[PDB]
Amino acid sequence: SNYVIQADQQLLDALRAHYEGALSDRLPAGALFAVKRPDVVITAYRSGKVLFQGKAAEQEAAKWISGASASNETADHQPSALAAHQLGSLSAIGSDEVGTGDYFGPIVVAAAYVDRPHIAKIAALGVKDSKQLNDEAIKRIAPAIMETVPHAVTVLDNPQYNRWQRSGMPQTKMKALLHNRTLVKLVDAIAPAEPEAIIIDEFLKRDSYFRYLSDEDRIIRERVHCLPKAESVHVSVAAASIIARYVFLEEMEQLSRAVGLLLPKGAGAIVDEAAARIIRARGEEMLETCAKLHFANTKKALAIAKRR
């Protein structure tokens, strides 16, 4: 009976550093490293899962964790990593959006093309876990990325957003249209070059995605991969997220200036108050130029406006 355990980042680092001569070439999908230890083979995965196989498996496992669970699991590929393992090193276009949940502002979709020779460079900019990066880091990293790799962006401003919405087009359909159009722009811009893969950070079922594009004049379908948390699959997606956020911030600064009031992000109470201030100082119609009207925030702001 081989043994498996769950190791945190500290444990993973200790394991890798401990065993001198750790192997990292030609390993199963998801595996970080393997140890050709005598009487026991150790394989550590991205998920933190570490497997001990061999005669002295239980013994080796005990050296790191107490009460190591035994299982029949083998050092095989991890389904969660099958995609990253194959797409990670390819030249690819990655796309993602921002602003969907923000009462104020547009929806921004960006796509970045990272050719094989630029993968390391973009990754060195610390694009991984872009979710952890604050706005100031975005303003710092985005420009570097835009300067290194080709990209495209499609900004859905509030007046157009509101028009599509009141017409019956839900956000899901809006996003599908924006991704497709942004992808079309990047594909033509990098031609004659062609990406080995096109990865869309999943926001809805593939089947539903293309159905929404049935009326589009041009549809990017070819080597399109719809994957969840795509940022962990390819640096191009992470790059897209950062660019999208950078543009969103830039749009918000411009929008706040046009409105004459600082527009907070999100859709909390502070947004309700801000919307109330806008109505009183500029008129309710001003919201049509800077907010996603159908949001519940509109009703709340109008109430606060008359309440004062």
Residues contributing to the annotated binding site for a divalent metal cation: 96-97, 201
Nearer to Mg ion, 109 or 301 (CB): 109
# chain residues binding Mg ion, by CB under 5 A: 3
Task: Give least dist CB 171 to Mg ion, A.
Answer: 12
Nearer to Mg ion, 118 or 245 (CB): 245
Distance between CA atoms of 225 and 202, rounded to whole angstroms?
9
Q: Does 231 bind Mg ion (CB under 5 A)?
A: no
List binders of Mg ion among 247-306 (CB under 5 A).
Answer: none
Task: Give least dist CB 35 to Mg ion, A.
Answer: 37
Task: Give least dist CB 112 to Mg ion, A.
Answer: 14
Task: Give least dist CB 227 to Mg ion, A.
Answer: 10
Nearer to Mg ion, 36 or 131 (CB): 131
Other C-beta atoms lying within 10 Å of the C-beta of residue 4: 21
Which parts are annotated binding residues for Mn(2+)?
96-97, 201
Task: Give least dist CB 7 to Mg ion, A.
Answer: 29
In angstroms, the Cα distances linking 272 to 70, 167, 288, 299 are 54, 24, 15, 9
Q: Contact letters (x/-) for Mg ion, 24-63, by CB under 5 A?
A: ----------------------------------------
Tell me which H or E stretch contains 183: helix 171-190
Nearer to Mg ion, 42 or 99 (CB): 99
Q: Which stretch binds Mg ion (CB under 5 A): 65-73, 91-99, 242-250, 293-301?
A: 91-99
**Three-state secondary structure call for residue 154:** strand
Task: Give least dist CB 244 to Mg ion, A.
Answer: 9
Inter-residue contact 102 to 266 (CB < 8 Å): yes
List binders of Mg ion among 170-189 (CB under 5 A).
Answer: none
With residues binned 3-state (H G I as helix, E B as strand, rest as coil), the percentages for the chain, rounded to 5, are 45, 20, 35
Residue number of the CB atom closest to Mg ion? 201
In one-letter notation, the amino acid at residue 137 is A
Q: Which two tokens stand for residue 185?
A: 């722009």
Inter-residue contact 265 to 273 (CB < 8 Å): no
Nearer to Mg ion, 108 or 274 (CB): 108
Q: Which stretch binds Mg ion (CB under 5 A): 193-201, 244-252, 264-272, 297-305?
A: 193-201
Q: For residue 197, which of 98, 78, 86 has the smallest C-alpha distance?
A: 86
Query: Please, is 239 exposed, middle or buried when counting C-beta atoms within 10 Å of its C-beta (0-12, 13-18, 19+)?
Result: buried
**Three-state secondary structure call for residue 265:** coil
Nearer to Mg ion, 245 or 300 (CB): 245
Query: Please, is 286 exposed, middle or buried when counting C-beta atoms within 10 Å of its C-beta (0-12, 13-18, 19+)?
Result: middle
Distance between CA atoms of 129 and 298, rounded to whole angstroms?
33
Q: Pick from 31, 52, 111, 201 the residue near Mg ion by CB under 5 A.
A: 201
Inter-residue contact 275 to 103 (CB < 8 Å): yes
Contact residues: Mg ion, CB under 5 A:
96, 201, 203
